[PDB]
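Q: I'm writing a short methods note and want an example of a predicted protein-small molecule complex. Could you take the sequence and the SMILES for QN7 and return the bound structure as tokens? Please keep the output block clean; save any remarks for afterwards.
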Amino acid sequence: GSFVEMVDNLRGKSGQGYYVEMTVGSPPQTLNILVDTGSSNFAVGAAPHPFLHRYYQRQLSSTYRDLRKGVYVPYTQGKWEGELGTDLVSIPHGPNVTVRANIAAITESDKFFINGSNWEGILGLAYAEIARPDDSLEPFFDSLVKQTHVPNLFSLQLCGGGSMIIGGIDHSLYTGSLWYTPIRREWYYEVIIVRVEINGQDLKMDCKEYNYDKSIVDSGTTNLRLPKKVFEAAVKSIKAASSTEKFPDGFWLGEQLVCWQAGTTPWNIFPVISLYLMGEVTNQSFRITILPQQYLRPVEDVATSQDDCYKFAISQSSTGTVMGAVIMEGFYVVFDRARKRIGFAVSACHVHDEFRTAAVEGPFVTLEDCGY
Ligand SMILES: COc1cccc(-c2cccc([C@@]3(c4ccncc4)N=C(N)N4CC(F)(F)CN=C43)c2)c1F
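A: Understood, no commentary inside the block.
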């Protein structure tokens, strides 16, 4: 169960989520599980659903222990509800270990499961503070670390497949240096953005605006989501750089597709976006540079296949900045829980062209606090 055998253990897309194979119960029941850095429950479909290929059958597991406790999760987009228990869990292409972990058996849901996503549950990798029903429900990663000799770190290489390396950093997954940003508070993986540039032009906003009311790293969100003020400025700058072509407002609202004849996408008309992240030392930062190949999400559809069609994968948020899968796809992302920091390095799998490459670079000096 070495890091070598963990390489390429993920499947999926930014639009429907990346997933890892896991087993629950004794004898083991195989399930595909969404890798979610934006939540903290290990929750699995445990009853039939039209979108589910398979589900967790607790009656077949002798190791299952009922916690006699309900869990009701209504959220802005939909809902999931079920009941708590613990059982034996393993990751076949992860560490060579079996742990006893909390499991939320999902018995009812609304707009949670996705048709054709190929996953049956979610692995919430964030901290206990945001676990449901409350912070006393120990998340999976915490149990994994407590019960084994697995180091308190994991890394994700999302390839627009991919890899989740548990307990370490695999040098074959990235090039150049790893740059670290502090985890501001252990709840979501909260970070601080200190500057935003669009085609080298500073948005010139007070840096607190970029983190209103928090900024997080979330593999379970598709888009780069920005606070209203930031979002409007970003769209204004992107529209200006790309003014040689005019797209419908629906496109900019991330609702409507933009299509070009297959192979003709005019990547060069779209600017680079640089997010400057707080460094590990005062008033020092590094930047992660996103290309349009990251922020223009292809929508695979046989019916539109004479063309290449895309959704604008930047959208407005009322709950802070969300550095989603489209952002993570350019990079190798190290969730260094042990040192309370997140590392970024150029991914060996990011999509680019002969003119531009996604980058992770620094240091940058700014001679105020950027957090809320
Ligand atoms: C890119 O990854 C994804 C793409 C499409 C859907 C999901 C997905 C599906 C169900 C639930 C979630 C969930 C979620 C997980 C657990 N409980 C509720 C929601 N995971 C995350 N990170 N978010 C962000 C949100 F804005 F909150 C909306 N919902 C979520 C994500 C996904 F992770």
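A: Remarks, as requested: Residues 151 and 167 are 5 Å apart (CA to CA). The pocket of QN7 is lined by residues 14, 16-17, 34, 36, 38-39, 73, 75, 77, 112, 114, 122, 218, 220-222, 325 (CB under 6 Å).
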